[PDB]
Amino acid sequence: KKVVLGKKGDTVELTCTASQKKSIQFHWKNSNQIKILGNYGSFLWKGPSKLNDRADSRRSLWDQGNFPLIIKNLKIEDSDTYICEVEDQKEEVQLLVFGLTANSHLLQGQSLTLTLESPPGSSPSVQCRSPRGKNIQGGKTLSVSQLELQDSGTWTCTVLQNQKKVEFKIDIVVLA
Amino acid sequence: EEHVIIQAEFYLNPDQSGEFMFDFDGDEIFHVDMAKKETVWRLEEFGRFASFEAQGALANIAVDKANLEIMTKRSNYTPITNVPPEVTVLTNSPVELREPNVLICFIDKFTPPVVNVTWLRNGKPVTTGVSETVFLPREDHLFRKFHYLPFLPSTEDVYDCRVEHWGLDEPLLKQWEF
Amino acid sequence: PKYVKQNTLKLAT
Amino acid sequence: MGDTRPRFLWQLKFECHFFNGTERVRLLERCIYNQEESVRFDSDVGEYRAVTELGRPDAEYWNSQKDLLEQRRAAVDTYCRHNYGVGESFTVQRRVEPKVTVYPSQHHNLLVCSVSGFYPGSIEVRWFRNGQEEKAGVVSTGLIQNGDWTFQTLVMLETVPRSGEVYTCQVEHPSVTSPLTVEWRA
């Protein structure tokens, strides 16, 4: 029913909304049907999960029909489809997590490549914006032929997936 | 990481409230009642195996108050941002009709350290045998607090912990019943 | 036994 | 609630961190204005360090007071290790046995194993079905701190009880020398 993009190391919030703004039995599962978390009355429980203790909800929002699943320190493998079952409803949300690094000592003139880490089933495409403003494009693996001092700085790469966006900022050390 | 002991104090204006305590792995060892310049152990037996001269805390608070004023000007009078509390009610054990138990109201992650808690049984406020803790520290620098209500489990009683804090627009009530 | 507290320090003024 | 005049909060924290008894100790002094830590002294660093611009005047000033600096460096002993020893018998060694109760929350039932009033936190709760440990179908609340030097937890097992089956909740905790167990007969 929905798609969410996340960055490696960050925290993402997957939403689940019930009809009436009133706390009620809910729980989240991964695509393999393994229970991640939910409540038993006022208690919050967790099941055996490849997400270990990086998962949580947000109690405060429970009174108004919001039972989110928050996963911190995202791993590429945390990508999957999560299913929240609330009041005879089944909200689905697919999480696609991406990572972005560079080759890197990078010398003035040598070429640098920006490799995007992607999860199964993804079909990404990258587009960055140099420190100066040069918007070299790319996809799976983007790169820049011959660097220069003026390229040292913070690059702003944008990854597009399912027509959705996620931003990355990386600092390059273009030596001389 | 096996153990952690924290000496935690604070001063709040314009309220003129101060607190001084020591906690061990998240539990309160003791605190100092400012008005009675007295050391209060979380559990009485603690006071038979150790002691703390309460005056030292009074001296620390005075310096805290003065430093709060210093920081208040230095920041150009930037006030604190209210963070409303998360409230949850539970029993300290499994409930069994007509058998002594204890209702626990856990007020978590809020600031500043000022709050109003009230126990309601069938709408009316109770106070017989109710106790509470002082403001306990959190690594995110917010606070936690516990309030207790010893009670006799009955199928015809409905309890409520009523909480008020600047971060909320209206009283937050958490219901509990057998 | 006696608990020993750390002393509060005056901030810069 | 009333009185919406703005508030100003100042907090001071002296944290003593222990690893393997007192083998390794780390002192951490933090100063927080409102919700922002401004300056701190980390025993592993030796001197004060500003966390935000508000603390700088202080990190510099305090760092210029060599006396103070040495006292803080040795507080790892005079303060931490000392205090550790003061209440070891009633904190580090505090022991309270957990009370264990097992009850059904309908065909696909849920057995609940409640464990309460125990200390310290380190504990282990497992579910068995006819002497064989069940791992899948088990969920848990983890440690619940009651604020009175006592913990509690609820370890729940999802299962379709079959007549004649025997479910067991097993608890291992520092207070008991041999595992506790409570059973439910299906």
The residue from A98, A113, A139 where one domain ends is A98
Whether residue B148 sits in one domain with residue B84: yes
d(CA D101, CA D112): 8
Whether residue B45 sits in one domain with residue B109: no
Whether residue D22 sits in one domain with residue D108: no
Whole-number CA gyration radius for chain C: 12
Query: Comparing C-alpha atoms, which of B121, B120, B91 is closest to residue B103?
Result: B91
HSE-up (13 A, CA, CB side) for residue A103: 14
Whether residue B154 sits in one domain with residue B106: yes
Nearest chain A CA: its distance from D157 CA (Å) = 10
Whether residue D137 sits in one domain with residue D88: no
Whether residue D75 sits in one domain with residue D12: yes
Cβ(B73)–Cβ(B153) below 8 Å: no
d(CA B67, CA D151): 37
Q: Please indicate whether, in this complex, the C-beta atoms of D139 and A45 are within 8 angstroms of each other.
A: yes
Whether residue B58 sits in one domain with residue B88: no
Amino acid at A159: V
Q: Which two tokens stand for residue A84?
A: 């929240």
Which experimental technique did the depositors report for determining this structure?
A: X-ray
Does C4 contact D at CB distance below 8 Å? Answer: yes
Cβ(A98)–Cβ(A117) below 8 Å: yes
B69: three-class secondary structure by DSSP: helix
* 3-state SS string for D34-47: CCEEEEEEECCCCC
Whether residue A116 sits in one domain with residue A72: no
Q: How many CB atoms lie within 10 A of CB A122?
A: 18
Nearest chain B CA: its distance from C12 CA (Å) = 8
- Chains contacting C (3 or more CB pairs within 8 Å): B, D
Q: How many CB atoms lie within 10 A of CB B154?
A: 13
Whether residue B85 sits in one domain with residue B63: no
Structural domain includes residue A176:
no
Q: Which two tokens stand for residue A144?
A: 């820049």
Chain centroid to Cα D182, Å, comes to: 26
Whether residue D72 sits in one domain with residue D118: no
Whether residue B86 sits in one domain with residue B70: no
Angle between helices D66-75 and D56-63 (to 10 degrees): 90
The residue from A38, A69, A98 where one domain ends is A98
Whether residue A130 sits in one domain with residue A49: no
Looking up tokens 């108004």 gives A64
Choose the mutation target among B63, B135, B141 for the interface with D, i.e. most D CBs under 10 Å.
Answer: B141
What letter does residue B80 receive in the DSSP assignment? P
HSE-up (13 A, CA, CB side) for residue B125: 7
The residue from B79, B107, B131 where one domain ends is B79
CATH of the domain at A70: 2.60.40.10
Domain range for B97: 80-178
d(CA B73, CA B52): 34
Whether residue D27 sits in one domain with residue D88: yes
Cβ(B129)–Cβ(B150) below 8 Å: yes
Total domains in the fold of chain A = 2
Domain range for D9: 1-93
Q: How many CB atoms lie within 10 A of CB B96?
A: 11
Query: Comparing C-alpha atoms, which of B32, B114, B117, B38 is closest to residue B80?
Result: B114
* Cis omega (within 30 of 0) for bond into D120: yes
Whether residue B38 sits in one domain with residue B109: no
d(CA D26, CA D43): 6
Q: Which two tokens stand for residue B128?
A: 């017989």
Cβ(D61)–Cβ(D69) below 8 Å: no
Domain range for A74: 1-98
Cβ(D117)–Cβ(D150) below 8 Å: yes
Q: Which two tokens stand for residue A174?
A: 């273009």
Total domains in the fold of chain D = 2
Q: Which two tokens stand for residue B171?
A: 């009283």
Cβ(D22)–Cβ(D2) below 8 Å: no
d(CA B74, CA B91): 45
Amino acid at B64: D
d(CA A114, CA A106): 12
CA distances from A98 to A70, A77, A123, A163 (A): 17, 10, 11, 15
CATH of the domain at B132: 2.60.40.10
State which residue of chain D sits closest to A44, comparing Cα positions: D141
Name D160's Cβ contacts closer than 8 Å, sequence gap at least 6.
D107, D108, D109
Which sign does the torsion angle of CA B139, B30, B110, A57 carry?
A: positive
d(CA B28, CA B137): 10
Cβ(A121)–Cβ(A31) below 8 Å: no
Nearest chain D CA: its distance from C13 CA (Å) = 8
Cβ(D18)–Cβ(B2) below 8 Å: yes
Chain centroid to Cα B23, Å, comes to: 13
Cβ(B118)–Cβ(B125) below 8 Å: yes
Total domains in the fold of chain B = 2
Of C2, C11, C12, the CB nearest to D86: C2
B84: three-class secondary structure by DSSP: coil
Beta bridge partners of D49: D40
Q: Please indicate whether, in this complex, the C-beta atoms of B52 and C3 are within 8 angstroms of each other.
A: yes
Cβ-based contacts under 8 A for chains A and B: 9
Does A40 contact B at CB distance below 8 Å? Answer: no
Instruction: Please report residues of B whose CB lies closer than 8 A to that of C2.
Output: 50-53
- Chains contacting B (3 or more CB pairs within 8 Å): A, C, D
Query: Comparing C-alpha atoms, which of D72, D13, D78 is closest to residue D45?
Result: D72
Chain centroid to Cα A56, Å, comes to: 16
Query: Comparing C-alpha atoms, which of B166, A17, B156 is closest to residue D9?
Result: B166
Residues A43, B109, A15, CA angle at the centre, nearest 5°? 60
Phi first, then psi, for residue B63 (nearest 5°) are -70, -35
A174: three-class secondary structure by DSSP: coil
- Chains contacting A (3 or more CB pairs within 8 Å): B, D
Q: Which two tokens stand for residue B104?
A: 């626990």
Whether residue B145 sits in one domain with residue B89: yes
Amino acid at B27: D
Q: Which two tokens stand for residue D54?
A: 């508000």
Q: Which two tokens stand for residue B72?
A: 């208040």
Quoted resolution (Å): 2.4
Cβ(D108)–Cβ(D100) below 8 Å: no
State which residue of chain B sits closest to A63, comparing Cα positions: B174
The residue from B15, B44, B79 where one domain ends is B79
Whether residue B154 sits in one domain with residue B103: yes
Q: Which two tokens stand for residue A11?
A: 């925290």
Phi first, then psi, for residue A15 (nearest 5°) are -90, 150
The secondary structure element, H or E, covering residue A152 is none
Q: Please indicate whether, in this complex, the C-beta atoms of D140 and A45 are within 8 angstroms of each other.
A: yes
State which residue of chain A sits closest to D155, comparing Cα positions: A45
**Please, where are the H alpha helices in chain B?**
55-74
Q: Which two tokens stand for residue A89?
A: 């409803």
Q: Please indicate whether, in this complex, the C-beta atoms of B68 and D9 are within 8 angstroms of each other.
A: yes
A15: three-class secondary structure by DSSP: coil
d(CA A11, CA A108): 35
d(CA A79, CA A81): 7
d(CA B85, CA B145): 10
Beta bridge partners of A166: A159
CATH of the domain at D61: 3.10.320.10
Q: How many CB atoms lie within 10 A of CB D100?
A: 19
Nearest chain D CA: its distance from C5 CA (Å) = 7
Instruction: Give contacts of A 47-76 with B, CB under 8 A.
Output: 59-60
Cβ(A136)–Cβ(A128) below 8 Å: yes
Of B56, B60, B71, the CB nearest to C11: B71
Q: Which two tokens stand for residue A56?
A: 């949580």
Cβ(B6)–Cβ(D16) below 8 Å: yes
Does A75 contact D at CB distance below 8 Å? Answer: no
Tally of residues, chain A: 176
Instruction: Please report residues of B whose CB lies closer than 8 A to that of D17.
Output: 1, 3-4
Cβ(A94)–Cβ(A121) below 8 Å: no
d(CA B32, CA B29): 11
d(CA B126, CA D2): 23
d(CA A71, CA B100): 39
Annotated binding site of D for a peptide antigen: 58, 62, 82-83, 94
Cβ(B111)–Cβ(B163) below 8 Å: no
The residue from D93, D125, D146 where one domain ends is D93
Cβ(B61)–Cβ(C1) below 8 Å: no
Q: Please indicate whether, in this complex, the C-beta atoms of C12 and D58 are within 8 angstroms of each other.
A: yes
Does A46 contact D at CB distance below 8 Å? Answer: yes
**Please, where are the H alpha helices in chain A?**
none
Whether residue D73 sits in one domain with residue D34: yes
Whether residue D175 sits in one domain with residue D121: yes
Looking up tokens 């219901």 gives B175
Q: How many CB atoms lie within 10 A of CB A121?
A: 10
Instruction: Please report residues of D whose CB lies closer than 8 A to that of C1.
Output: 85-87
Instruction: Please report residues of C whose CB lies closer than 8 A to that of D82.
Output: 4
